[PDB]
Amino acid sequence: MKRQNVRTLSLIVCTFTYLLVGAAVFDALESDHEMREEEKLKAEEIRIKGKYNISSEDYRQLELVILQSEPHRAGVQWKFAGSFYFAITVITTIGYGHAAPGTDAGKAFCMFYAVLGIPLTLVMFQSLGERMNTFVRYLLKRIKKCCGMRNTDVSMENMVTVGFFSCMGTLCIGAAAFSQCEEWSFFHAYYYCFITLTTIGFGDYVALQTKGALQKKPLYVAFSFMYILVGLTVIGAFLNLVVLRFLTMNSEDERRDAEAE
Amino acid sequence: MKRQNVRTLSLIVCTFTYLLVGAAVFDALESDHEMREEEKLKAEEIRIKGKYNISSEDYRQLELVILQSEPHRAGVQWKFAGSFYFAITVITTIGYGHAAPGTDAGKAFCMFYAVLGIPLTLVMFQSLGERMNTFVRYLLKRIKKCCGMRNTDVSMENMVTVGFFSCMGTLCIGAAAFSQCEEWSFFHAYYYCFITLTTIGFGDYVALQTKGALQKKPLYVAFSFMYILVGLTVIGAFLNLVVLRFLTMNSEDERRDAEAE
Ligand SMILES: CC(C)CCC[C@@H](C)[C@H]1CC[C@H]2[C@@H]3CC=C4C[C@@H](OC(=O)CCC(=O)O)CC[C@]4(C)[C@H]3CC[C@]12C
Ligand SMILES: CC(C)CCC[C@@H](C)[C@H]1CC[C@H]2[C@@H]3CC=C4C[C@@H](OC(=O)CCC(=O)O)CC[C@]4(C)[C@H]3CC[C@]12C
Ligand SMILES: CC(C)CCC[C@@H](C)[C@H]1CC[C@H]2[C@@H]3CC=C4C[C@@H](OC(=O)CCC(=O)O)CC[C@]4(C)[C@H]3CC[C@]12C
Ligand SMILES: CC(C)CCC[C@@H](C)[C@H]1CC[C@H]2[C@@H]3CC=C4C[C@@H](OC(=O)CCC(=O)O)CC[C@]4(C)[C@H]3CC[C@]12C
Ligand SMILES: [K+]
Ligand SMILES: [K+]
Ligand SMILES: [K+]
Ligand SMILES: [K+]
Ligand SMILES: [K+]
């Protein structure tokens, strides 16, 4: 009886203590960096606003104009290439938000589109991940036969090893690809890859948004979309191997508790 | 044998055709709206840049200054309240990106923090969702006993009804709460609630970012965090009821295929 509850409460208490350990570390890592940046930006504002004697209403309007032009200076978003990039970022839940629906009709359709798109996408990547893990298990057992191993067992530790180095590999191949095209540093390209395939998607870095690359370099658009849909497949297969048993075993324990009645 | 493959391929083909149906509709809904907005913003830029004779290097620097000041004009982010809000938006994968780690040390810690935080959060919300569905099943069967129903069965259709109206309810309670505090329209507040609890998180709308509300209105900070952690629990419970069987039945079918050997 109680086992389901004690594991639920221990998960909750673990989560909230993990948030506290998070928050106090992000304060320690960069409250001072924000404090430097604010002062430096304020000085640059004051000197420019003064040198041109910009009126407060004019500066406010210019600020709004700049902030709303930021999504357009990267090149036209809402054409088929960019609408396909957006649709990917909705149904996979990346949600960069480099562009977002302007009209209320766009917002309303985006909600109805996500409602159906996301269950479909979860079931697709989890099915294709289970196929990947089955294929890897076959090829690894055959590899042990070819290597003449003393037994053909393929333990959980072997699968978890190949899964983890598949994740590390696909992130490094992403970083090496994007750093050569977007001119980000390798570390920032790796950060962008991790934040994409994890589906966090802050959207401070966004691929393709460079001198109209969404229109002038369609082979690289194709790479970016295939990289998302393949990388999420590999991460999905890794969660399918390591984590998914824990989602169901609470219900399995409840079924066992009912069968013990 | 083939059933696992034909369902995998049909899911893939369904996903890609669903992306095409998406992209061609977002083009139809708002390519023209972008085309109007670009022209209007270009005219406002030209008139202001000309009226003050702003030099191109000065305008470029001012543009960078404005874009980097946007995350600070909302109030200081990296203090405990804002670091806790950020930590929520990482481990739940909302990822608004209203703020993002400035220093490379912040980025590196954010990656190690997400790696462990997200599996923990999935297991927490799926466990707590399974608890919610069990409790709802109990209370609904007792409600049928109290109402004197001709039988005490609690079918899937009854659970799916209560789950769906729980999702619709928690979104409406969110929209009614935020529209009264952020001064968004009710539709935009509902859009923000749906985009938050779906974990897409574009970050064009973000709660708390208003005249320092992260520091002056801590009771409303508390509401925003509880609304995220409760709303995701309800959405998690709904996916646990409707979708989760489809993630596993592909492996169950493979086990059956092995047992038939
Ligand atoms: C993706 C890779 C890099 C990391 C994967 C980590 C997860 C597999 C870990 C992280 C947190 C773990 C959970 C943290 C705490 C608990 C509570 C624990 O419950 C108890 O001990 C209660 C008493 C009992 O059930 O015996 C059961 C395991 C569980 C769910 C853990 C299951 C495994 C989790 C999800
Ligand atoms: C299912 C698996 C086995 C195969 C996947 C095939 C991919 C190589 C396809 C699927 C969708 C394709 C993309 C769909 C749409 C576009 C937009 C297209 O852009 C335009 O036509 C420009 C439009 C404009 O600028 O108005 C360039 C090709 C591209 C990126 C395609 C590149 C090739 C992709 C990624
Ligand atoms: C969250 C609410 C609002 C919507 C939930 C929708 C899902 C429950 C639907 C959406 C798309 C559906 C999938 C679309 C297509 C298929 C392929 C289908 O495969 C076959 O028919 C192959 C042959 C066979 O297996 O008999 C099996 C069901 C499945 C996975 C569906 C399972 C149920 C899904 C995930
Ligand atoms: C687990 C369940 C059953 C109970 C959940 C309790 C909540 C009501 C707690 C958990 C975390 C708490 C929050 C943790 C941290 C803060 C930041 C705090 O802000 C400050 O102290 C300002 C700091 C600064 O400005 O430097 C205001 C209260 C608040 C939002 C707390 C409000 C109450 C919360 C949401
Ligand atoms: K997400
Ligand atoms: K996001
Ligand atoms: K997201
Ligand atoms: K985002
Ligand atoms: K943004």
XYZ file of C-alpha atoms and ligand atoms in Angstrom:
667
model
C 0.000 0.000 0.000
C 2.311 2.715 1.281
C 5.153 2.073 -1.177
C 3.472 4.076 -3.950
C 2.955 6.974 -1.566
C 6.416 6.988 -0.024
C 7.998 6.990 -3.494
C 5.683 9.827 -4.566
C 6.526 11.964 -1.533
C 10.235 11.221 -1.810
C 10.119 12.295 -5.464
C 8.385 15.564 -4.528
C 10.817 16.380 -1.720
C 13.732 15.463 -3.985
C 12.404 17.789 -6.698
C 11.950 20.812 -4.429
C 15.349 20.352 -2.795
C 16.825 20.013 -6.275
C 15.234 23.339 -7.226
C 16.780 25.007 -4.173
C 20.195 23.549 -5.027
C 19.657 24.931 -8.506
C 18.518 28.446 -7.656
C 21.233 29.174 -5.089
C 23.870 28.068 -7.590
C 22.581 30.194 -10.470
C 22.642 33.162 -8.083
C 26.232 32.329 -7.186
C 27.267 31.843 -10.811
C 25.950 35.054 -12.322
C 24.163 37.630 -10.151
C 27.367 39.679 -10.374
C 27.609 39.198 -14.143
C 24.139 40.673 -14.534
C 25.148 43.501 -12.204
C 28.112 44.370 -14.443
C 26.096 44.074 -17.662
C 23.275 46.326 -16.439
C 25.692 49.119 -15.483
C 27.592 48.890 -18.777
C 24.429 48.929 -20.885
C 23.028 51.835 -18.864
C 26.177 53.877 -19.534
C 26.056 53.116 -23.274
C 22.395 54.145 -23.340
C 22.993 57.391 -21.460
C 25.888 58.465 -23.685
C 24.049 57.752 -26.951
C 20.705 59.200 -25.826
C 22.485 62.362 -24.691
C 24.752 62.775 -27.713
C 21.720 62.852 -30.039
C 19.358 64.539 -27.510
C 16.777 61.813 -28.126
C 13.354 62.630 -26.705
C 11.875 60.122 -24.269
C 8.835 59.365 -26.439
C 11.091 59.034 -29.481
C 13.405 56.667 -27.604
C 10.456 54.604 -26.334
C 9.042 54.281 -29.853
C 12.460 53.431 -31.283
C 12.852 50.763 -28.584
C 9.561 49.135 -29.585
C 10.517 49.389 -33.270
C 13.858 47.670 -32.637
C 12.392 44.906 -30.469
C 9.718 44.114 -33.061
C 12.222 44.299 -35.940
C 14.576 41.744 -34.345
C 12.506 38.779 -35.681
C 12.471 40.275 -39.209
C 16.100 41.367 -39.653
C 17.037 37.666 -39.764
C 15.017 37.201 -42.960
C 11.405 36.466 -43.773
C 10.062 33.819 -41.411
C 6.615 32.909 -42.731
C 7.425 31.243 -46.015
C 7.323 27.510 -46.542
C 10.860 26.863 -45.298
C 10.281 28.945 -42.182
C 6.763 27.656 -41.600
C 8.157 24.124 -41.711
C 10.897 25.101 -39.271
C 8.254 26.596 -36.980
C 6.024 23.524 -37.235
C 8.977 21.360 -36.198
C 9.615 23.635 -33.225
C 5.968 23.386 -32.130
C 5.183 19.681 -32.365
C 8.539 18.609 -30.947
C 7.991 21.260 -28.220
C 11.382 22.908 -28.800
C 9.593 26.245 -29.018
C 12.469 28.600 -29.786
C 10.120 31.523 -30.256
C 12.342 33.246 -32.793
C 8.988 33.771 -34.486
C 5.564 33.401 -32.934
C 2.058 33.748 -34.360
C 1.188 37.388 -34.906
C -2.530 37.251 -35.625
C -5.016 35.851 -33.132
C -6.004 33.340 -35.810
C -2.403 32.143 -35.876
C -2.346 31.742 -32.096
C -5.650 29.843 -32.121
C -4.513 27.475 -34.843
C -1.190 26.984 -33.060
C -3.072 25.754 -29.996
C -5.235 23.294 -31.939
C -2.148 22.202 -33.882
C -0.110 21.468 -30.753
C -2.952 19.560 -29.053
C -2.900 16.854 -31.716
C 0.709 17.192 -32.857
C 2.444 16.463 -29.564
C 0.875 13.086 -28.645
C 1.562 11.975 -32.227
C 5.190 13.070 -31.947
C 5.743 11.365 -28.588
C 4.366 8.094 -29.918
C 6.489 8.415 -33.061
C 9.813 9.055 -31.328
C 9.193 6.453 -28.622
C 8.268 3.816 -31.216
C 11.251 4.649 -33.408
C 13.468 4.667 -30.323
C 12.295 1.184 -29.381
C 13.154 0.099 -32.921
C 16.625 1.626 -32.575
C 17.288 -0.144 -29.272
C 16.137 -3.463 -30.736
C 18.410 -3.045 -33.759
C 21.366 -2.046 -31.572
C 20.764 -5.108 -29.400
C 20.832 -7.351 -32.473
C 23.952 -5.785 -33.994
C 25.776 -5.810 -30.648
C 25.007 -9.485 -30.002
C 26.161 -10.333 -33.524
C 29.291 -8.238 -32.899
C 29.981 -10.380 -29.825
C 29.544 -13.511 -31.949
C 31.917 -12.130 -34.594
C 34.450 -11.181 -31.912
C 34.252 -14.727 -30.536
C 33.143 -13.613 -27.077
C 32.864 -16.317 -24.423
C 29.125 -15.609 -24.255
C 26.554 -13.782 -26.373
C 24.769 -12.056 -23.490
C 23.935 -8.387 -24.089
C 23.462 -6.910 -20.632
C 21.807 -3.648 -19.632
C 25.231 -2.096 -18.967
C 26.272 -2.747 -22.578
C 23.123 -1.146 -23.969
C 23.404 1.843 -21.625
C 27.026 2.289 -22.704
C 26.137 2.365 -26.398
C 23.140 4.616 -25.743
C 25.157 7.140 -23.751
C 27.967 7.324 -26.286
C 25.330 7.655 -29.013
C 24.003 10.747 -27.232
C 27.503 12.153 -26.719
C 28.326 11.405 -30.349
C 25.255 13.029 -31.864
C 25.838 16.145 -29.752
C 29.478 16.370 -30.861
C 28.547 15.846 -34.529
C 25.979 18.604 -34.137
C 28.445 20.995 -32.523
C 31.081 20.283 -35.181
C 28.501 20.900 -37.907
C 26.973 24.123 -36.575
C 30.240 25.727 -35.461
C 31.493 25.477 -39.050
C 28.380 27.185 -40.466
C 26.968 29.678 -37.931
C 30.455 30.823 -36.794
C 29.632 30.197 -33.143
C 32.410 28.892 -30.949
C 32.453 25.124 -30.552
C 31.280 25.313 -26.944
C 28.311 27.503 -27.848
C 27.462 25.216 -30.761
C 27.510 22.259 -28.371
C 25.334 24.221 -25.952
C 22.880 24.932 -28.765
C 22.804 21.249 -29.699
C 22.174 20.133 -26.123
C 19.464 22.769 -25.579
C 17.804 21.701 -28.831
C 17.787 17.933 -28.378
C 16.767 18.325 -24.737
C 13.741 20.308 -26.040
C 14.402 23.176 -23.625
C 14.951 25.578 -26.507
C 15.719 28.935 -24.907
C 16.083 30.514 -28.326
C 19.025 32.757 -27.530
C 20.876 30.704 -30.142
C 18.867 29.665 -33.206
C 20.216 27.926 -36.315
C 19.369 28.997 -39.890
C 18.651 32.553 -38.757
C 21.600 34.000 -40.661
C 21.554 36.347 -43.679
C 18.467 34.608 -45.064
C 19.948 31.106 -44.834
C 16.348 29.837 -44.768
C 16.241 30.790 -48.463
C 19.800 30.876 -49.859
C 21.163 27.571 -48.450
C 18.426 24.912 -48.678
C 20.888 22.015 -48.290
C 21.732 23.434 -44.861
C 18.067 23.879 -44.001
C 17.718 20.182 -44.824
C 20.593 19.320 -42.503
C 19.079 21.313 -39.635
C 15.706 19.580 -39.899
C 17.217 16.114 -40.221
C 19.491 16.844 -37.267
C 16.509 17.695 -35.075
C 14.447 14.677 -36.104
C 17.396 12.255 -35.823
C 18.814 13.705 -32.607
C 15.484 13.555 -30.815
C 15.216 9.934 -31.944
C 18.524 9.090 -30.268
C 17.638 10.942 -27.053
C 14.216 9.294 -27.098
C 15.824 5.875 -27.429
C 18.069 6.651 -24.463
C 15.145 7.696 -22.260
C 13.298 4.612 -23.492
C 16.141 2.434 -22.252
C 17.011 4.082 -18.926
C 13.981 5.985 -17.610
C 10.767 4.545 -19.053
C 10.580 1.570 -16.661
C 10.156 4.018 -13.749
C 7.082 5.667 -15.275
C 5.132 2.396 -15.329
C 6.410 0.520 -12.269
C 4.258 2.677 -9.976
C 1.169 1.334 -11.751
C 2.658 -2.165 -11.755
C 3.095 -1.857 -7.978
C -0.527 -0.743 -7.643
C -1.677 -3.725 -9.718
C 0.382 -6.011 -7.471
C -1.229 -4.408 -4.410
C -4.662 -5.103 -5.903
C -3.723 -8.697 -6.756
C -2.575 -9.177 -3.154
C -6.090 -8.273 -1.956
C 6.779 -9.579 -36.851
C 5.795 -6.861 -39.300
C 3.210 -5.169 -37.067
C 5.857 -3.214 -35.146
C 7.372 -2.027 -38.407
C 4.145 -1.086 -40.155
C 3.064 0.964 -37.127
C 6.484 2.651 -37.027
C 6.388 3.572 -40.718
C 2.777 4.718 -40.527
C 3.702 6.955 -37.586
C 6.604 8.468 -39.549
C 4.528 9.111 -42.672
C 1.737 10.538 -40.516
C 4.208 12.886 -38.808
C 5.733 14.248 -42.020
C 2.342 14.742 -43.661
C 1.206 16.473 -40.481
C 4.184 18.829 -40.752
C 3.252 19.673 -44.345
C -0.357 20.336 -43.320
C 1.064 22.568 -40.618
C 3.552 24.576 -42.655
C 1.207 25.365 -45.548
C -1.396 26.610 -43.077
C 0.967 28.879 -41.142
C 1.996 30.377 -44.489
C -1.660 30.940 -45.328
C -2.452 32.414 -41.915
C 0.284 35.016 -41.654
C 2.810 35.465 -44.476
C 0.878 38.624 -45.372
C 0.808 39.808 -41.755
C 4.592 39.619 -41.641
C 4.719 41.445 -44.971
C 2.672 44.328 -43.539
C 4.645 44.450 -40.282
C 8.041 44.548 -42.011
C 7.027 47.502 -44.203
C 5.544 49.437 -41.276
C 8.584 48.892 -39.059
C 10.925 49.837 -41.908
C 9.082 53.139 -42.387
C 9.209 53.925 -38.652
C 12.935 53.165 -38.643
C 13.657 55.322 -41.686
C 11.761 58.335 -40.339
C 13.396 58.216 -36.895
C 16.912 57.472 -38.171
C 16.613 60.373 -40.610
C 15.060 62.885 -38.216
C 18.020 62.512 -35.826
C 20.631 61.848 -38.576
C 21.788 58.745 -36.705
C 25.069 57.340 -38.000
C 25.049 53.711 -39.118
C 27.632 52.600 -36.546
C 25.763 54.512 -33.843
C 22.474 52.891 -34.863
C 24.073 49.427 -34.945
C 25.526 49.909 -31.460
C 22.238 51.288 -30.143
C 20.453 48.254 -31.616
C 22.764 45.873 -29.754
C 22.374 47.934 -26.566
C 18.574 47.774 -26.796
C 18.454 44.049 -27.569
C 20.737 43.235 -24.631
C 18.858 45.610 -22.302
C 15.477 43.964 -22.995
C 16.142 41.172 -20.420
C 17.169 43.739 -17.765
C 14.456 46.397 -18.128
C 11.995 43.862 -16.676
C 13.896 43.836 -13.375
C 16.871 41.962 -12.000
C 16.675 38.311 -13.008
C 19.474 36.565 -11.118
C 18.327 36.853 -7.537
C 16.819 33.995 -5.593
C 13.260 34.551 -6.818
C 14.400 34.767 -10.427
C 16.914 31.944 -10.125
C 14.120 29.748 -8.783
C 11.876 30.800 -11.658
C 14.677 29.949 -14.088
C 15.333 26.580 -12.449
C 11.644 25.731 -12.838
C 11.798 26.697 -16.508
C 14.838 24.458 -17.068
C 13.923 21.207 -15.337
C 10.321 21.271 -16.538
C 11.722 22.113 -20.016
C 9.480 25.169 -20.447
C 12.571 27.161 -21.375
C 11.117 30.635 -21.860
C 14.549 32.143 -22.343
C 13.569 35.504 -20.899
C 16.955 35.104 -19.234
C 19.698 32.690 -20.187
C 23.115 31.976 -18.682
C 25.550 34.747 -19.514
C 28.874 33.273 -18.450
C 30.238 30.074 -19.953
C 30.264 28.649 -16.429
C 26.529 29.298 -16.245
C 25.943 27.528 -19.559
C 28.053 24.544 -18.484
C 26.251 24.189 -15.176
C 22.900 24.567 -16.935
C 23.745 21.549 -19.085
C 24.773 19.361 -16.143
C 21.720 20.597 -14.231
C 19.282 19.687 -17.007
C 20.812 16.228 -17.553
C 19.823 15.099 -14.064
C 16.862 17.410 -13.493
C 14.679 16.306 -16.392
C 14.500 12.526 -15.773
C 13.737 13.324 -12.123
C 10.957 15.703 -13.150
C 9.391 13.263 -15.617
C 9.301 10.527 -12.996
C 7.847 12.947 -10.442
C 5.000 14.258 -12.595
C 4.148 10.829 -14.004
C 4.054 9.297 -10.514
C 1.969 12.140 -9.112
C -0.294 11.934 -12.156
C -0.876 8.234 -11.555
C -1.785 9.113 -7.970
C -4.240 11.746 -9.210
C -5.927 9.324 -11.612
C -6.227 6.702 -8.870
C -7.783 9.219 -6.479
C -10.187 10.481 -9.152
C -11.208 6.896 -9.895
C -11.968 6.307 -6.212
C -13.915 9.543 -5.724
C -15.872 9.027 -8.954
C -16.870 5.465 -8.043
C -17.939 6.659 -4.596
C -19.866 9.492 -6.281
C -21.719 6.870 -8.330
C -22.511 4.972 -5.125
C -23.767 8.165 -3.463
C -25.862 9.008 -6.531
C -27.382 5.518 -6.394
C -26.229 4.585 -9.892
C -27.427 1.243 -11.246
C -23.795 0.098 -11.320
C -20.493 1.264 -9.846
C -18.412 0.749 -12.989
C -15.990 3.580 -13.788
C -15.244 3.221 -17.485
C -12.422 4.738 -19.512
C -14.854 7.247 -21.051
C -15.728 8.584 -17.588
C -12.078 9.029 -16.636
C -11.232 10.658 -19.973
C -14.163 13.038 -19.502
C -12.986 14.143 -16.062
C -9.381 14.385 -17.252
C -10.254 16.542 -20.252
C -12.438 18.917 -18.267
C -9.681 19.081 -15.646
C -7.300 20.302 -18.354
C -9.850 22.786 -19.704
C -10.570 23.956 -16.164
C -6.969 24.501 -15.116
C -6.313 26.456 -18.318
C -9.356 28.677 -17.735
C -8.408 29.269 -14.082
C -4.936 30.212 -15.269
C -6.233 32.607 -17.913
C -8.647 34.229 -15.450
C -5.814 34.649 -12.947
C -3.153 36.061 -15.276
C -5.465 38.368 -17.231
C -6.352 40.115 -13.964
C -2.687 40.671 -13.035
C -0.566 41.078 -16.193
C -3.280 43.102 -18.012
C -3.169 40.812 -21.035
C -6.432 40.131 -22.803
C -8.172 36.950 -21.705
C -7.385 35.181 -24.973
C -3.684 35.992 -24.714
C -3.659 34.900 -21.075
C -5.236 31.601 -22.120
C -2.657 31.286 -24.894
C 0.113 31.870 -22.359
C -1.357 29.222 -20.063
C -1.628 26.651 -22.846
C 1.903 27.373 -24.113
C 3.221 27.041 -20.560
C 1.529 23.811 -19.508
C 2.266 22.262 -22.900
C 5.965 23.035 -22.190
C 6.413 24.707 -25.581
C 7.257 28.012 -23.926
C 7.903 30.444 -26.771
C 8.602 33.211 -24.286
C 6.892 36.014 -26.168
C 4.582 36.187 -23.151
C 6.206 35.651 -19.749
C 4.530 36.050 -16.352
C 6.098 37.932 -13.411
C 8.202 40.049 -15.765
C 6.390 43.262 -14.862
C 7.755 46.313 -13.004
C 9.872 44.082 -10.766
C 6.982 41.816 -9.756
C 9.627 39.173 -8.980
C 10.495 41.333 -5.955
C 7.491 43.518 -5.048
C 4.681 40.901 -5.183
C 5.969 37.630 -3.680
C 2.456 36.225 -3.143
C 2.004 36.411 -6.917
C 5.389 34.818 -7.530
C 4.146 31.995 -5.306
C 0.979 31.665 -7.370
C 2.937 31.492 -10.630
C 5.206 28.704 -9.393
C 2.358 26.694 -7.894
C 0.371 27.140 -11.101
C 3.200 25.659 -13.158
C 3.803 22.708 -10.845
C 0.076 21.943 -10.441
C -0.854 22.491 -14.086
C 1.881 20.203 -15.354
C 0.628 17.595 -12.885
C -2.856 17.723 -14.407
C -1.553 17.578 -17.989
C 0.776 14.751 -16.982
C -2.137 12.826 -15.502
C -4.079 13.292 -18.736
C -1.218 11.988 -20.883
C -0.816 9.159 -18.380
C -4.432 8.171 -18.939
C -4.795 8.596 -22.710
C -1.377 8.283 -24.368
C 0.991 6.260 -22.180
C -0.383 2.842 -23.198
C 0.800 3.502 -26.778
C 4.415 4.071 -25.729
C 4.715 0.586 -24.222
C 2.456 -1.556 -26.418
C 5.110 -1.655 -29.154
C 7.442 -3.415 -26.712
C 4.568 -5.585 -25.489
C 3.956 -6.611 -29.111
C 7.647 -7.441 -29.508
C 7.552 -9.553 -26.337
C 4.492 -11.365 -27.703
C 6.347 -11.971 -30.978
C 9.244 -13.469 -29.014
C 6.900 -15.628 -26.924
C 5.322 -16.910 -30.147
C 8.743 -18.197 -31.263
C 19.327 10.280 -18.115
C 20.444 9.866 -17.180
C 21.694 10.675 -17.454
C 20.027 9.985 -15.733
C 18.805 9.177 -15.333
C 18.423 9.372 -13.875
C 17.147 8.640 -13.430
C 17.192 7.190 -13.894
C 16.975 8.789 -11.908
C 17.126 10.255 -11.454
C 16.270 10.409 -10.184
C 15.840 8.976 -9.851
C 14.681 8.740 -8.878
C 14.985 9.412 -7.541
C 14.251 8.806 -6.383
C 13.463 7.749 -6.453
C 12.594 7.357 -5.282
C 12.740 5.886 -4.946
O 11.700 5.564 -3.972
C 12.075 4.978 -2.828
O 13.210 4.687 -2.566
C 10.895 4.732 -1.934
C 10.932 3.367 -1.274
C 10.999 2.210 -2.253
O 10.302 2.295 -3.294
O 11.737 1.243 -1.979
C 12.518 5.029 -6.170
C 13.506 5.407 -7.273
C 13.357 6.874 -7.693
C 11.972 7.093 -8.326
C 14.506 7.231 -8.682
C 14.377 6.499 -10.020
C 15.517 6.815 -10.985
C 15.666 8.321 -11.233
C 14.434 8.870 -11.968
C 11.496 10.169 -43.842
C 12.984 10.060 -44.112
C 13.375 8.623 -44.408
C 13.391 10.997 -45.229
C 13.357 12.480 -44.892
C 13.505 13.366 -46.120
C 14.154 14.738 -45.866
C 15.513 14.799 -46.558
C 13.186 15.859 -46.294
C 11.863 15.813 -45.501
C 11.330 17.258 -45.457
C 12.258 18.025 -46.407
C 12.294 19.556 -46.362
C 10.896 20.116 -46.599
C 10.898 21.546 -47.042
C 11.972 22.233 -47.391
C 11.878 23.710 -47.688
C 12.554 24.055 -48.999
O 12.585 25.511 -49.103
C 11.997 26.064 -50.171
O 11.485 25.430 -51.054
C 12.061 27.560 -50.113
C 10.686 28.186 -49.976
C 10.692 29.701 -49.932
O 11.769 30.280 -49.686
O 9.602 30.288 -50.147
C 13.973 23.538 -49.026
C 13.982 22.021 -48.836
C 13.358 21.611 -47.496
C 14.222 22.155 -46.345
C 13.251 20.059 -47.448
C 14.620 19.383 -47.346
C 14.534 17.860 -47.327
C 13.624 17.341 -46.206
C 14.219 17.677 -44.829
C -4.201 14.313 -26.083
C -5.469 14.109 -26.885
C -6.200 15.422 -27.067
C -5.183 13.458 -28.218
C -4.487 12.109 -28.154
C -4.199 11.531 -29.530
C -3.425 10.203 -29.532
C -4.063 9.231 -28.547
C -3.351 9.655 -30.968
C -2.881 10.730 -31.968
C -2.170 9.983 -33.111
C -2.451 8.505 -32.818
C -1.614 7.424 -33.508
C -1.715 7.581 -35.023
C -1.438 6.318 -35.779
C -1.195 5.142 -35.229
C -0.704 3.986 -36.067
C -1.516 2.730 -35.817
O -0.823 1.632 -36.485
C -1.526 0.878 -37.342
O -2.691 1.043 -37.576
C -0.667 -0.189 -37.954
C -1.365 -1.533 -38.030
C -1.843 -2.058 -36.690
O -1.084 -1.892 -35.703
O -2.955 -2.620 -36.635
C -1.581 2.415 -34.341
C -2.190 3.587 -33.571
C -1.370 4.870 -33.742
C 0.023 4.681 -33.116
C -2.143 6.050 -33.084
C -2.224 5.922 -31.561
C -3.009 7.057 -30.908
C -2.454 8.437 -31.279
C -1.043 8.622 -30.703
C 5.180 20.769 -1.720
C 3.829 21.443 -1.572
C 2.874 20.569 -0.779
C 3.987 22.814 -0.951
C 4.640 23.868 -1.834
C 5.016 25.127 -1.067
C 5.019 26.424 -1.894
C 3.899 27.343 -1.413
C 6.418 27.069 -1.847
C 7.503 26.139 -2.430
C 8.612 27.055 -2.981
C 8.214 28.454 -2.497
C 8.853 29.690 -3.137
C 10.371 29.618 -3.004
C 11.042 30.947 -3.155
C 10.421 32.112 -3.204
C 11.186 33.381 -3.498
C 10.860 34.468 -2.495
O 11.485 35.700 -2.969
C 12.355 36.302 -2.149
O 12.615 35.907 -1.044
C 12.953 37.517 -2.790
C 14.444 37.363 -3.028
C 15.104 38.573 -3.658
O 14.375 39.421 -4.211
O 16.355 38.650 -3.586
C 9.368 34.687 -2.404
C 8.672 33.391 -1.989
C 8.919 32.263 -2.998
C 8.281 32.637 -4.346
C 8.325 30.942 -2.429
C 6.795 30.961 -2.389
C 6.198 29.684 -1.806
C 6.674 28.427 -2.546
C 6.161 28.426 -3.994
K 9.778 21.365 -24.049
K 11.020 26.451 -25.143
K 10.422 24.003 -24.616
K 11.730 29.355 -25.767
K 13.143 35.143 -27.012
